[PDB]
Write an enzyme that holds these catalytic residues in place. Structure first.
Site, PDB file in Angstrom:
ATOM      1  N   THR A 159       0.804  -1.319  -0.001  1.00 54.43           N
ATOM      2  CA  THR A 159       0.084  -0.094  -0.108  1.00 54.43           C
ATOM      3  C   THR A 159       0.879   1.273   0.145  1.00 54.43           C
ATOM      4  O   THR A 159       0.591   2.349  -0.818  1.00 54.43           O
ATOM      5  CB  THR A 159      -1.049   0.009   1.072  1.00 54.43           C
ATOM      6  OG1 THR A 159      -1.814  -1.271   1.129  1.00 54.43           O
ATOM      7  CG2 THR A 159      -1.887   1.058   1.218  1.00 54.43           C
ATOM      8  N   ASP A 308      -4.178   0.023  -5.980  1.00 58.45           N
ATOM      9  CA  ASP A 308      -2.786   0.214  -5.390  1.00 58.45           C
ATOM     10  C   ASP A 308      -1.858  -1.282  -5.970  1.00 58.45           C
ATOM     11  O   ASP A 308      -0.690  -1.039  -6.208  1.00 58.45           O
ATOM     12  CB  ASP A 308      -2.577   0.617  -3.986  1.00 58.45           C
ATOM     13  CG  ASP A 308      -3.187  -0.166  -3.216  1.00 58.45           C
ATOM     14  OD1 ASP A 308      -4.058  -1.266  -3.460  1.00 58.45           O
ATOM     15  OD2 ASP A 308      -2.908   0.059  -2.040  1.00 58.45           O
ATOM     16  N   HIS A 309      -2.644  -2.151  -5.583  1.00 57.08           N
ATOM     17  CA  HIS A 309      -2.073  -3.576  -5.793  1.00 57.08           C
ATOM     18  C   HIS A 309      -2.975  -4.712  -5.828  1.00 57.08           C
ATOM     19  O   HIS A 309      -4.408  -4.269  -5.436  1.00 57.08           O
ATOM     20  CB  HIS A 309      -0.960  -3.842  -4.846  1.00 57.08           C
ATOM     21  CG  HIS A 309      -1.450  -3.720  -3.628  1.00 57.08           C
ATOM     22  ND1 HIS A 309      -2.318  -4.652  -2.773  1.00 57.08           N
ATOM     23  CD2 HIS A 309      -1.183  -2.752  -2.654  1.00 57.08           C
ATOM     24  CE1 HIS A 309      -2.866  -4.010  -1.792  1.00 57.08           C
ATOM     25  NE2 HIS A 309      -2.072  -2.901  -1.758  1.00 57.08           N
ATOM     26  N   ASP A 682      26.628   0.526 -14.630  1.00 56.25           N
ATOM     27  CA  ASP A 682      25.726   1.018 -13.384  1.00 56.25           C
ATOM     28  C   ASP A 682      26.312   0.578 -12.030  1.00 56.25           C
ATOM     29  O   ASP A 682      25.586  -0.177 -11.368  1.00 56.25           O
ATOM     30  CB  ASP A 682      23.995   0.829 -13.412  1.00 56.25           C
ATOM     31  CG  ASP A 682      23.366   1.668 -12.750  1.00 56.25           C
ATOM     32  OD1 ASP A 682      23.898   2.742 -12.382  1.00 56.25           O
ATOM     33  OD2 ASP A 682      22.273   1.182 -12.349  1.00 56.25           O
ATOM     34  N   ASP A 690      26.496   5.276 -15.942  1.00 63.23           N
ATOM     35  CA  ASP A 690      27.913   5.678 -15.267  1.00 63.23           C
ATOM     36  C   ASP A 690      28.626   6.776 -16.312  1.00 63.23           C
ATOM     37  O   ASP A 690      28.929   6.178 -17.613  1.00 63.23           O
ATOM     38  CB  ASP A 690      28.503   4.543 -15.060  1.00 63.23           C
ATOM     39  CG  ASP A 690      27.798   3.834 -13.742  1.00 63.23           C
ATOM     40  OD1 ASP A 690      26.996   4.142 -13.440  1.00 63.23           O
ATOM     41  OD2 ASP A 690      28.259   2.718 -13.390  1.00 63.23           O
TER      42      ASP A 690
HETATM   43  C1  XH0 Z   1       0.569   5.893   1.508  1.00 63.55           C
HETATM   44  C2  XH0 Z   1      -0.038   7.210   0.922  1.00 63.55           C
HETATM   45  N1  XH0 Z   1       0.755   7.949  -0.295  1.00 63.55           N
HETATM   46  N2  XH0 Z   1      -0.149   8.930  -0.695  1.00 63.55           N
HETATM   47  N3  XH0 Z   1      -1.366   8.813   0.031  1.00 63.55           N
HETATM   48  C3  XH0 Z   1      -2.393   9.474  -0.233  1.00 63.55           C
HETATM   49  C4  XH0 Z   1      -3.244   8.842  -1.341  1.00 63.55           C
HETATM   50  C5  XH0 Z   1      -2.977   9.108  -2.722  1.00 63.55           C
HETATM   51  C6  XH0 Z   1      -3.840   8.503  -3.596  1.00 63.55           C
HETATM   52  C7  XH0 Z   1      -3.611   8.647  -5.005  1.00 63.55           C
HETATM   53  F1  XH0 Z   1      -2.220   8.771  -5.297  1.00 63.55           F
HETATM   54  F2  XH0 Z   1      -3.661   7.314  -5.684  1.00 63.55           F
HETATM   55  F3  XH0 Z   1      -4.155   9.489  -5.691  1.00 63.55           F
HETATM   56  C8  XH0 Z   1      -4.975   8.197  -3.367  1.00 63.55           C
HETATM   57  C9  XH0 Z   1      -5.506   8.009  -1.853  1.00 63.55           C
HETATM   58  C10 XH0 Z   1      -4.648   8.550  -0.987  1.00 63.55           C
HETATM   59  C11 XH0 Z   1      -5.028   8.321   0.496  1.00 63.55           C
HETATM   60  C12 XH0 Z   1      -4.775   7.197   0.977  1.00 63.55           C
HETATM   61  C13 XH0 Z   1      -5.255   7.365   2.688  1.00 63.55           C
HETATM   62  O1  XH0 Z   1      -6.313   8.008   2.970  1.00 63.55           O
HETATM   63  N4  XH0 Z   1      -4.772   6.521   3.500  1.00 63.55           N
HETATM   64  C14 XH0 Z   1      -4.842   6.793   5.024  1.00 63.55           C
HETATM   65  C15 XH0 Z   1      -5.080   5.354   5.365  1.00 63.55           C
HETATM   66  C16 XH0 Z   1      -3.763   4.300   5.048  1.00 63.55           C
HETATM   67  C17 XH0 Z   1      -4.291   2.887   5.611  1.00 63.55           C
HETATM   68  C18 XH0 Z   1      -2.978   2.043   5.874  1.00 63.55           C
HETATM   69  S1  XH0 Z   1      -3.548   0.623   6.652  1.00 63.55           S
HETATM   70  O2  XH0 Z   1      -5.097   0.392   6.267  1.00 63.55           O
HETATM   71  C19 XH0 Z   1      -2.560  -0.478   5.765  1.00 63.55           C
HETATM   72  N5  XH0 Z   1      -1.402  -0.285   5.694  1.00 63.55           N
HETATM   73  C20 XH0 Z   1      -0.802  -1.206   4.710  1.00 63.55           C
HETATM   74  C21 XH0 Z   1      -1.562  -2.195   4.431  1.00 63.55           C
HETATM   75  S2  XH0 Z   1      -1.189  -3.507   3.053  1.00 63.55           S
HETATM   76  N6  XH0 Z   1      -2.539  -3.447   2.702  1.00 63.55           N
HETATM   77  O3  XH0 Z   1      -1.007  -4.611   3.852  1.00 63.55           O
HETATM   78  O4  XH0 Z   1      -0.002  -3.129   2.292  1.00 63.55           O
HETATM   79  S3  XH0 Z   1      -3.112  -1.849   4.878  1.00 63.55           S
HETATM   80  C22 XH0 Z   1      -3.465   4.511   3.704  1.00 63.55           C
HETATM   81  C23 XH0 Z   1      -3.589   5.669   3.418  1.00 63.55           C
HETATM   82  N7  XH0 Z   1      -1.182   7.825   0.747  1.00 63.55           N
HETATM   83 CA    CA Z   2      -3.043  -1.472  -0.389  1.00 63.04          CA
HETATM   84 CA    CA Z   3      24.804   4.748 -12.494  1.00 63.07          CA
HETATM   85 ZN    ZN Z   4      -3.092  -5.575   2.233  1.00 68.08          ZN
END
Ligand code: XH0
Ligand code: CA
Ligand code: CA
Ligand code: ZN
Ligand SMILES: *[C@@H]1O[C@H](CO)[C@@H](O[C@@H]2O[C@H](CO)[C@@H](O[C@@H]3O[C@H](CO[C@H]4O[C@H](CO)[C@@H](O)[C@H](O[C@H]5O[C@H](CO)[C@@H](O)[C@H](O)[C@@H]5O[C@H]5O[C@H](CO)[C@@H](O)[C@H](O)[C@@H]5O)[C@@H]4O)[C@@H](O)[C@H](O[C@H]4O[C@H](CO)[C@@H](O)[C@H](O)[C@@H]4O[C@H]4O[C@H](CO)[C@@H](O)[C@H](O)[C@@H]4O)[C@@H]3O)[C@H](O)[C@H]2NC(C)=O)[C@H](O)[C@H]1NC(C)=O
Ligand code: CL
Ligand code: K
Ligand code: NA
Length: 804
Positions: A159, A308-309, A682, A690
């Site tokens: 995330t 995101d993934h 690199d 480089d």
């Molecule tokens: C990082 C990051 N960088 N920039 N942003 C802002 C952003 C950018 C976009 C974009 F770019 F697409 F437009 C969209 C939405 C947002 C808001 C995300 C938001 O409100 N968040 C608050 C809650 C958090 C939960 C972590 S926990 O629930 C978990 N942590 C890890 C997890 S996992 N799934 O195991 O990896 S779940 C996430 C962030 N956020």
């Molecule tokens: Ca995620």
């Molecule tokens: Ca380099």
């Molecule tokens: Zn997750």
């Protein structure tokens, strides 16, 4: 300290944040334990739920209600999203036919179409097809808008790295958010999902979109949402912001959903429990679209639906334990799970040795489900090295597995899903849909990488992007208008075209060749070849441009053309074309160790055979392969000292199989191929070419620098009914960046014949043309028939080798 006795009255979800100790009413105040005492009462109302009903229509305004069904709600901008459907006979947006949005249809006072980013956590690419029956709103956005079959995340496929990549257009190594957990040794500080260190700005590099917008006078809604604000309230807050006066109203907004990731971890990506989270997300989209329609904004706003993934089936029984390999397991710190990062537990332990840890982790068990790397040896396509927060030792974990330090870490199962694996893995892919005036209508685009989207979001808002890792113009084909039309970069160094200038006896290189073998038909012929007569066959897309200051020569031959560097004493590039009909031949016995001086290139700017003889570790290969010579006489060109490059014997196995077997295989399968190959240096693993002063290794006793990698770009016609050298239309490409290593430890089955392991190696080290461009300072595909944006898309293509 927070003086929590201010009030949130008329400040609910305020857009400018206030300084401690003053209390906060913004969408992050809960995350800071800083909300004013009355934030829940005033800002998080829930009374009477989220939907108007028949009996609420025309009600007297009651400010206690979560949303309104009274007559004034539209001009107040706080109606429930279904108000006009229940109360004014309107249809839900999802029930309306798709109709092309040719121009923005916006209320007066709107200076630009707003952008709303609807981001969903863990939304695996195949949910679009597999869940389509239960996601009608998403399905209409997808079918009517512009969509990709999938969007590639960055590594690691977690995330925090990926949301911040979405926001900045930067690789994690550049933006600094390299994991969900990190240790920065300069700060001596740890970043974790829980806790407060993650709010410190010093972790967060680059320039995210909301900053880009603000600096250029475009107002932004706050992107982050505290987890306890319900989705309905997020949507209603956005819709309320869209009713602000012109001078106060943002142009860019983000919604974020923690689903379906949250449930995926618990139930696996396709657990039967997953249908309900997918339905609920769809309903949320429906609330936004209905709400936009009420505000006459549904044909004005550009909406991006982006993940995101993805999510993979992972259970605790599929864990590898470092305690099964390492005797010294308590002397290390592991960042665990779907990747591994290892460093010493104590920097005072002088007995900590990374070489012995790597060796203890290398090919120890027949089915081993992780592979260790020093970070600089990771596939260059991951761009996962140039940050002090990325530990020197890395573990690439197989899909479906975890790695942990010791068994007690895993039992002191819960979870059935996880993510974080290599970003080419099919289960990690996520989604992209764009819908709006600025996106195309009913258009499918090819898969692309999420690092590209920042530039497009900038284009959508009329912003100049901050410097990033996207290739601006490569996604022009998603857009109806606001395309970005870049000019090709200017060539910095022009080549020399040397003729025959040196007699054989001027060379004292220690090289020998059995070639004293003697006609005006065939002498004028070979002269013409050396002057470039076959160059149109072997250089199909023009010569690459050199984008930095250097001294190099163009060298023509019957079978290949090269750009030869006087500084690095080898080609920067070597270009040749192999038709479907080409024949593979062997190196004749008399030519086995043949190396021939090049009478166009001074002894002083040549390699020498004696250095290779003296350097007991280093051998040599050739860039244009002797095996593919067009004739016995042409073959002599392949043994020129100017076609030679330094190669470890271990690497020669790989390179020989590529050249002898695979090139011909691709030319058969693709109806001819054009190949450009070359060295990459690199040494500081920054993904960039480089300079000479960065080279850490030379062929013993000489000034011949040793590459860290070797590339090839393999181009043909997308319409494989046309030969590569007579292609009228779009091109097709695959490329690689192979690590130039003195062993094949990476490949656990390397004792077997090259047919059992080399191609698997090459697949892992698949690359974009743009990756090679960064690494060489060269610009390819300069002279084609094709539009430049199309070529930029070509340059960002990655051949992944995954199934459908
Ligand atoms: C990082 C990051 N960088 N920039 N942003 C802002 C952003 C950018 C976009 C974009 F770019 F697409 F437009 C969209 C939405 C947002 C808001 C995300 C938001 O409100 N968040 C608050 C809650 C958090 C939960 C972590 S926990 O629930 C978990 N942590 C890890 C997890 S996992 N799934 O195991 O990896 S779940 C996430 C962030 N956020
Ligand atoms: Ca995620
Ligand atoms: Ca380099
Ligand atoms: Zn997750
Ligand atoms: C992907 O896209 C990005 C963005 O375009 C590319 O990254 C850029 O690469 C450039 C070259 O590597 C780099 O340019 C350098 O910038 C230096 C100024 O940097 C600061 O200011 C900028 C501007 O606001 C800022 O963005 C930087 O942010 C980085 O650092 C902070 C920490 O402060 C991090 O929070 C942030 O995440 C980011 O980190 C990343 O980059 C740094 C390097 O800057 C890495 O070390 C990190 O690991 C991480 O990857 C900075 O705040 C500038 O000072 C440099 O100048 C040196 O080189 C020039 C050559 O022109 C030379 O002439 C000068 O003398 C100078 O050398 C002197 O310093 C040397 C080092 O101390 C010393 O050895 C010498 O002897 C000299 O004293 C240089 O111009 C640019 O910063 C980054 N930008 C970003 C955002 O990363 C990236 O290349 C792309 N990737 C690919 C694969 O294409
Ligand atoms: Cl991590
Ligand atoms: K040698
Ligand atoms: Na091996």
């Amino acid at each position: 300290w927070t003086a929590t006795s201010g009030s949130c009255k008329g400040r609910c979800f305020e857009l400018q944040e206030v300084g401690p100790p003053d209390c906060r009413c913004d969408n992050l105040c809960k995350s800071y334990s800083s909300c004013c005492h009355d934030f829940d009462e005033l800002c998080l109302k829930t009374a009477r739920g989220w939907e108007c009903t028949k009996d609420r229509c025309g009600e007297v305004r009651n400010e206690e209600n979560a949303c309104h069904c009274s007559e004034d709600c539209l001009s107040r901008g706080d109606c429930c999203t279904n108000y006009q459907v229940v109360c004014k006979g309107e249809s839900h947006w999802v029930d309306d036919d798709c109709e092309e949005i040719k121009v923005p249809e916006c209320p007066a006072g709107f200076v630009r179409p707003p952008l709303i980013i609807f981001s969903v956590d863990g939304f695996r690419a195949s949910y679009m097809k597999k869940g389509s029956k239960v996601m009608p709103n998403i399905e209409k956005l997808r079918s009517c808008g512009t969509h990709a079959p999938y969007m590639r995340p960055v590594y690691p496929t977690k995330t925090f790295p990926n949301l911040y990549t979405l926001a900045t257009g930067l690789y994690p190594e550049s933006h600094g958010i390299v994991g969900n957990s990190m240790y920065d040794p300069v700060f001596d500080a740890s970043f974790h999902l829980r806790g407060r260190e993650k709010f410190n700005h010093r972790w967060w590099g680059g320039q995210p979109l909301w900053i880009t917008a603000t600096k250029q006078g475009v107002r932004a809604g706050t992107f982050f949402w505290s987890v306890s604000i319900p989705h309905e309230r997020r949507i209603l807050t956005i819709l309320q912001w869209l009713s602000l006066p012109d001078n106060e109203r943002p142009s860019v907004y983000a919604f974020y959903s923690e689903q379906p990731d949250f449930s995926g971890h618990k139930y696996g990506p396709f657990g039967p429990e997953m249908t309900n989270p997918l339905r609920e997300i769809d309903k949320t989209v429906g609330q936004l679209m209905d709400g936009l329609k009420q505000l006459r904004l549904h044909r004005c706003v550009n909406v991006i639906f982006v993940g995101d993934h993805g999510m993979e089936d992972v259970t605790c029984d599929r864990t590898e334990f470092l305690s099964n390999y390492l005797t010294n397991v308590d002397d290390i710190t592991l960042v665990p799970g779907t990747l591994g990062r290892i460093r010493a537990k104590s920097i005072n332990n002088s007995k900590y040795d990374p070489k012995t840890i790597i060796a203890a982790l290398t090919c120890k068990k027949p089915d081993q489900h992780f592979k260790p790397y020093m970070k600089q040896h990771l596939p260059k396509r991951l761009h996962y090295a140039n940050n002090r927060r990325i530990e020197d030792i890395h573990l690439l974990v197989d899909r479906r597995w975890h790695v942990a330090r010791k068994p007690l870490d895993v039992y002191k199962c819960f979870f059935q899903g996880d993510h974080g694996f290599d970003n080419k893995v099919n289960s990690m892919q996520t989604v992209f849909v764009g819908y709006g005036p600025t996106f195309k209508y009913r258009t499918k685009v090819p898969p692309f990488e999420n690092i590209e989207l920042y530039n497009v979001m900038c284009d959508l808002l009329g912003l100049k992007p901050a410097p990033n890792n996207g290739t601006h113009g490569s996604l022009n084909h998603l857009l109806r208008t606001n395309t970005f039309r870049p000019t090709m970069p200017d060539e910095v160094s022009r080549p020399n075209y040397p003729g025959i200038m040196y007699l054989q006896s001027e060379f004292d290189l220690g090289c020998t060749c059995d070639d004293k073998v003697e006609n005006k038909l065939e002498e004028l012929n070979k002269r013409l070849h050396t002057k470039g007569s076959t160059k149109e066959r072997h250089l199909l897309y023009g010569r690459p441009a050199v984008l930095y200051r250097t001294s190099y020569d163009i060298l023509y031959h019957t079978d290949f053309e090269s750009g030869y560097s006087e500084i690095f004493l080898m080609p920067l590039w070597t270009s040749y074309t192999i038709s479907k009909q080409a024949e593979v031949s062997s190196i004749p016995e008399h030519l086995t160790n043949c190396v021939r001086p090049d009478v166009r290139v001074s002894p002083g700017f040549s390699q020498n055979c004696l250095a290779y003889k003296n350097d007991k570790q280093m051998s040599y290969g050739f860039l244009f392969p002797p095996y593919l010579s067009s004739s016995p006489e042409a073959k002599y060109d392949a043994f020129l000292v100017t076609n030679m490059v330094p190669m470890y014997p271990a690497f020669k196995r790989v390179w020989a199989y590529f050249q002898r077997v695979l090139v011909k295989k691709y030319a058969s399968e693709r109806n001819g191929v054009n190949v450009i190959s070359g060295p990459i240096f690199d040494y500081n693993y920054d993904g960039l070419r480089d300079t000479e002063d960065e080279i850490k290794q030379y062929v013993e006793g000489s000034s011949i620098p040793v590459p860290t990698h070797y590339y090839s770009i393999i181009t043909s016609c997308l319409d494989f009914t046309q030969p590569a050298d007579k292609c009228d239309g779009p091109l097709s490409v695959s490329s690689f960046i192979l690590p130039h290593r003195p062993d094949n430890d990476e490949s656990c089955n390397s004792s077997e014949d090259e047919s059992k392991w080399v191609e698997e190696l090459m697949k892992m080290h698949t690359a974009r043309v743009r990756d090679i461009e960064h690494l060489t300072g060269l610009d390819f595909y300069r002279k084609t028939s094709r539009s430049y944006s199309e070529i930029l898309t070509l340059k960002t293509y990655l051949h992944t080798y995954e199934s459908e």
